[PDB]
């Protein structure tokens, strides 16, 4: 899960990390009166959406840019007007982008030096890791490419804890001279602990830096939380809005279902994630355009086949459906029945293609073909895909 | 070393199992199914009731107990998310040979703390978490996989997913090939056993003549696999390796079901995984529907039928 920038700075602040002073706004007037209330040389007004890209993004008020700097409390106001209420699209959001309901009016700051520092669990390291380059400001993945030697790492020992020498070793590699160093390092230590404290898969700071006035500041930072640790991070997840989550996606979760939309017209739904990915793939391999990805887990249950279909009903981009269910733990006719029960009972009017596999598959297929419904039994996953595809040309 | 416990993965008719989380609505269902199949399920832990009998079988309050008492050599866990990692450690404590954590949802931080330890002791070996388990068809089944779809045979199978594996197994038997040993290593990012761990076992198994490797987006386990095969499977007696990787159509930045199934920071995509294994001699099936027919042909070319 991800929180809004104003929520994660809050959080960083309460755990001793130094960030810019700031105010949150729901109206263009609160924003404007906030820039006056700050009282400073310059001001950063940043729309709040979880998708990165805000900088170069474009609003639907016509306004270009999700991030703006101005010393005049007024420019803030006029700019705000064009954000609250509108949608922001970025190189990272759906073509019509996310709606914006709050802006952040924080005090700009002089960035003397710009560095990159991030903390995560590394997939080859097992155990925390500090990743930082003295060349902050730019998109890490580019430094990594152009100058691999400006990327330092410090594996950390999950039992031991971060070592003073490591924070110093990093601070050093990051560019902090003499005095500043011991303050950099202590911020690093404070982040690492924040990181373990909150069950983050990642705490990224970019830029991490220094003001001319002598402070070590995380001017920007992204934080990814481990969705599995929610049961022990209720405070943090309480802040998760869900305002931004896609609708069908939201509904689907209520029923332990896991949905994700693609831009096609052939929906599908499978039991098991691996097989749901493979299903979207085989469709495409055969010329289709999968409409979504749906995983029911290993929890087949007449109830879900129903909500599962219910959902598909939503996306009116859908022209067909492929059901790939590998039974194993249950009789395939019970599944066929529930499929059809749910189908008439949901007055469907789109071609259905089912591929059931497991136990008692023959009678199960009989039910699907002897249903009167616009259903079609499929022999295997390839047959299933070929049909669904044919079914919409 | 941890490396040195790989051998415990090869469960068989001699292996005796205890189910941590025995009276739970889950350990219940699978124990009736494990015994039916024909597995050496001796009992199960469940603090509190630690002295009664469940399913015509003994119950203990702890892992350490039930080990000694029943002699047992493998522990399977069905303990809910918040405690599941505790259970792994309670198993590594009593030095159990094989630990299979079925549980999905365990905090990733928990598992890094677990592997911290797990990579130090050599008595225990962990498969999981978030995995269907392991099966030596006909001899031993520890997990939630439908047994009747397996046929003892020649193909060693290793996968990060559950049902997709079932597809493969079904597809292999239908061409009559069968399996030697199947290991579902799970869909989580940090786990006790990876691909290479299993490939060593298959590469030195005489019973294993071919290998099917099922992967997906996220992480580098696939790329390490391709590396390992280049190094240990080239030359005059290499075994054929067939593979499918899911997620070619997955959008980036999203969690495709499994916690570890996510393309992040530009890393974890299928295309690069597929290109690496190919570079190591691995024939990669394009359709997941063709793993049986694909490895079948490989055997036929080498005239191994």
UniProtKB/Swiss-Prot annotation, chain A:
Binding site for Mg(2+): 206, 220
Cofactor: Mg(2+)
N6-succinyllysine: residues bearing it: 41, 301
Occurrences of domain ATP-grasp (ranges): 9-237
Coiled coil: none
Phosphoserine: residues bearing it: 124
InterPro entries: ATP-grasp_succ-CoA_synth-type, ATP_grasp_subdomain_1, Succ-CoA_synthase_bsu_CS, SUCC_ACL_C, Succ_CoA_betaG_euk, Succ_CoA_ligase-like_bsu, Succinyl-CoA_synth-like
Site (Important for substrate specificity): 42, 110
Disulphide-bonded residues: none
GO biological process: succinyl-CoA metabolic process; tricarboxylic acid cycle
Subcellular location, record wording: Mitochondrion
Pathway: Carbohydrate metabolism; tricarboxylic acid cycle; succinate from succinyl-CoA (ligase route): step 1/1
EC code: 6.2.1.4
Gene3D superfamilies membership: ATP-grasp fold, A domain, ATP-grasp fold, B domain, Succinyl-CoA synthetase domains
Binding site for GTP: 20, 53-55, 109
Superkingdom per UniProt: Eukaryota
Subunit architecture: Heterodimer of an alpha and a beta subunit. The beta subunit determines specificity for GTP.
NCBIfam families: PRK00696.1, sucCoAbeta
Chain's role: GTP-specific succinyl-CoA synthetase functions in the citric acid cycle (TCA), coupling the hydrolysis of succinyl-CoA to the synthesis of GTP and thus represents the only step of substrate-level phosphorylation in the TCA. The beta subunit provides nucleotide specificity of the enzyme and binds the substrate succinate, while the binding sites for coenzyme A and phosphate are found in the alpha subunit.
Name this protein carries in UniProt: Succinate--CoA ligase [GDP-forming] subunit beta, mitochondrial
Organism from which the protein derives: Sus scrofa
Lineage, broadest ranks: Eukaryota, Metazoa, Chordata, Craniata, Vertebrata
Curated annotation (Swiss-Prot), chain B:
EC numbers, comma separated: 6.2.1.4, 6.2.1.5
Subunit structure: Heterodimer of an alpha and a beta subunit. Different beta subunits determine nucleotide specificity. Together with the ATP-specific beta subunit SUCLA2, forms an ADP-forming succinyl-CoA synthetase (A-SCS). Together with the GTP-specific beta subunit SUCLG2 forms a GDP-forming succinyl-CoA synthetase (G-SCS).
Organism of origin: Sus scrofa (Pig)
An annotated GO cellular component: mitochondrion
Pfam families attached to this UniProt entry: CoA_binding, Ligase_CoA
N6-acetyllysine carried by residues: 13, 16, 25, 64
Similarity remark: Belongs to the succinate/malate CoA ligase alpha subunit family.
Location within or outside the cell: Mitochondrion
Tissue note: Isoform I is expressed in all tissues examined: liver, brain, heart, and skeletal muscle. Isoform II is expressed only in heart and skeletal muscle.
Modified residues (N6-succinyllysine): 16, 25, 297
HAMAP family linked to this entry: Succ_CoA_alpha
Keywords: Acetylation, Ligase, Mitochondrion, Nucleotide-binding, Transit peptide, Tricarboxylic acid cycle
Catalysed transformations (reactions): succinate + ATP + CoA = succinyl-CoA + ADP + phosphate; GTP + succinate + CoA = succinyl-CoA + GDP + phosphate
Stated role: Succinyl-CoA synthetase functions in the citric acid cycle (TCA), coupling the hydrolysis of succinyl-CoA to the synthesis of either ATP or GTP and thus represents the only step of substrate-level phosphorylation in the TCA. The alpha subunit of the enzyme binds the substrates coenzyme A and phosphate, while succinate binding and specificity for either ATP or GTP is provided by different beta subunits.
Main subcellular location: mitochondrion
Annotated InterPro entries: Cit_synth/succinyl-CoA_lig_AS (IPR017440), Citrt_syn/SCS-alpha_CS (IPR033847), CoA-bd (IPR003781), CoA_lig_alpha (IPR005810), NAD(P)-bd_dom_sf (IPR036291), SUCC_ACL_C (IPR005811), Succinyl-CoA_synth-like (IPR016102)
Molecular function via GO: nucleotide binding; succinate-CoA ligase (ADP-forming) activity; succinate-CoA ligase (GDP-forming) activity
Name of this chain's protein: Succinate--CoA ligase [ADP/GDP-forming] subunit alpha, mitochondrial
Active site: 258 (tele-phosphohistidine intermediate)
Pathway: Carbohydrate metabolism; tricarboxylic acid cycle; succinate from succinyl-CoA (ligase route): step 1/1
């Amino acid at each position: 899960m991800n929180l809004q920038e104003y929520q994660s700075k809050k959080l960083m602040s309460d755990n001793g990390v130094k960030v810019q002073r700031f105010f949150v706004a729901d109206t263009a007037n609160e924003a404007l009166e906030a820039a006056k209330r700050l009282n400073a040389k310059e001001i950063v007004l940043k729309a709040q959406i979880l998708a990165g890209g805000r900088g170069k993004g474009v609003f639907s008020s016509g306004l270009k840019g999700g991030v703006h700097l101005t010393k005049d409390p007024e420019v803030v106001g006029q700019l705000a007007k064009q954000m609250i209420g509108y949608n922001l699209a970025t190189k990272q959001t759906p073509k019509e982008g996310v709606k914006v309901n709050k802006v952040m009016v924080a005090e700009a700051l002089d960035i003397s030096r710009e560095t990159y520092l991030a903390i995560l669990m590394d997939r080859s390291c097992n155990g925390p890791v500090l990743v930082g380059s003295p060349q902050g400001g730019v998109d890490i993945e580019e430094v990594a490419a152009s100058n691999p030697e400006l990327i330092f790492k410090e594996q950390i020992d999950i039992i031991e804890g971060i070592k003073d020498s490591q924070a110093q070793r990093m601070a050093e590699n990051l560019g902090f001279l003499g005095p500043l160093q011991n303050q950099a390092a202590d911020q690093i230590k404070k982040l690492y602990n924040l990181f373990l404290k909150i069950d983050a898969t990642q705490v990224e700071v970019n830029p991490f830096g220094e003001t001319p006035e002598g402070q070590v500041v995380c001017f920007d930072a992204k934080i990814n939380f481990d969705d599995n640790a929610e049961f022990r991070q209720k405070d943090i997840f309480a802040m998760d809005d869900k305002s931004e989550n896609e609708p069908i996606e939201n509904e689907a979760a209520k029923y332990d279902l896991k949905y994700i939309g693609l831009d096609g017209n052939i929906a599908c739904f499978v039991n098991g994630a691996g097989l749901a990915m493979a299903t979207c793939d085989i469709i495409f391999l055969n010329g289709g355009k999968p409409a979504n990805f749906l995983d029911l887990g290993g929890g087949v249950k007449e109830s879900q086949v129903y909500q599962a279909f219910k959902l598909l009903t939503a996306d009116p981009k859908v022209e067909a459906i492929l059901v790939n269910i590998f039974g194993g733990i249950v009789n395939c006719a019970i599944i066929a029945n529930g499929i059809t029960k749910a189908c008439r009972e949901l007055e469907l009017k789109v071609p259905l293609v089912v591929r059931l596999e497991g136990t008692n598959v023959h009678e199960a297929q009989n039910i699907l073909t002897n249903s009167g419904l616009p259903i079609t039994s499929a022999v295997d996953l390839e047959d299933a895909a070929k049909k669904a595809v044919a079914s919409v040309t | 070393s941890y490396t040195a416990s790989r051998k415990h993965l090869y469960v068989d008719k001699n292996t005796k199992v205890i189910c941590q989380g025995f009276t739970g609505k889950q350990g219940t269902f699978h124990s009736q199914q494990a015994l039916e199949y024909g597995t050496n399920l001796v009992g199960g832990t469940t603090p509190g009731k630690g002295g009664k009998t469940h399913l015509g079988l003994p119950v203990f309050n702890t892992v350490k107990e039930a080990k000694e008492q029943t002699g047992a050599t493998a522990s399977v866990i069905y303990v809910p998310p918040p405690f599941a990692a505790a259970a792994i450690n309670e198993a590594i404590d009593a030095e159990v040979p094989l630990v299979v954590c079925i549980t999905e949802g365990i905090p990733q931080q928990d598992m890094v703390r677990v592997k911290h330890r797990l990579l130090r002791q050599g008595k225990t070996r962990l498969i999981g978490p978030n995995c269907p388990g392991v099966i030596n068809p006909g001899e031993c089944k520890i997990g939630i996989m439908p047994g009747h779809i397996h046929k003892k045979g020649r193909i060693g199978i290793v996968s990060r997913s559950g049902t997709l594996t079932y597809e493969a197994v079904h597809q292999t038997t239908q061409v009559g090939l069968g399996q030697s040993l199947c290991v579902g290593i799970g869909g989580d990012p940090f786990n006790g056993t990876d691909f290479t761990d299993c490939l060593e076992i298959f590469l030195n198994d005489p019973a294993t003549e071919g290998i099917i490797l099922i992967g997906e987006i996220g992480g580098n386990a696939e790329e390490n696999a391709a590396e390992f095969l280049k190094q240990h499977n080239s030359g005059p007696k290499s075994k054929p390796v067939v593979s499918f990787i899911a997620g070619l159509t997955a959008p980036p930045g999203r969690r495709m079901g499994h916690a570890g199934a996510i393309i992040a920071g530009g890393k974890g995509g299928a295309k690069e995984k597929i290109t690496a294994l190919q570079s190591a001699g691995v024939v990669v099936s394009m359709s997941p529907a063709q793993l049986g027919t694909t490895i079948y042909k490989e055997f036929e070319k080498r005239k191994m039928l």
